[model samples]
Target: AIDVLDVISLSLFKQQIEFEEDDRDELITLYAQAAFDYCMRWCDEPAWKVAADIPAAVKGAVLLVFADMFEHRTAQSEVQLYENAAAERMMFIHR
Candidate 1:
């Protein structure tokens, strides 16, 4: 199990998505939660559980996933895989 709450917050996420409207908060929340969960799983399992301090880059990773999934909802290439790789770099620093 993990120790902390959200690696990213919905408010900052709205800004990350450049969202100025109130209509899609639910979807935004879903995407952020999904991204956060993915990041948790993607982390080095042994170190992830005891992580008390979450990283800023982890939130960036969440945003990256949110951005990619949202953008591609309507498309994964090598760059897409690279995007996830980039996310892994963001979340694997707890040990």
Candidate 2:
């Protein structure tokens, strides 16, 4: 079940993403889309329920998944060729 602390954690995580100005909106959209995808695929809930009245615990879980994707994308961008390939392979396995 959701609790206040879970809500707070998810909100804070959302705020921490440092998307570039030009792509901020796009990234936010992508994150939300990814969150919904994760929730539906792994949480066994419809996207509408998650969007309409999200439980704090569910939101928290979604945020963690979102963070993982964000970090994986960032790492792939910043790392060298071999490391980037390895990271992509690892993320693919997790997905």
Top TM-score hit: 1
Q: Model 2 Cα RMSD, Å?
A: 8.3
Model 2 clash count equals 0
Position 55, candidate 1: lDDT: 60
Per-model TM-score versus the true fold: 0.67, 0.48
Error of 2 at 67 (Å): 1.6
Model 2, span 1-95: residue lDDT tens: 33322234334555656543544555655665666465546544443332435554555555556666766676446555343243233334323
For model 2, what is the alpha-carbon lDDT of residue 50?
24
Q: List the residue pairs that clash in candidate 1.
A: 72-75
Report the lDDT tens digits of candidate 1 across residue range 61-94: 7688877765666443545344457766666663
Q: Backbone clashes per model, in order? A: 1, 0
Could you tell me which residue pairs clash in candidate 2? none
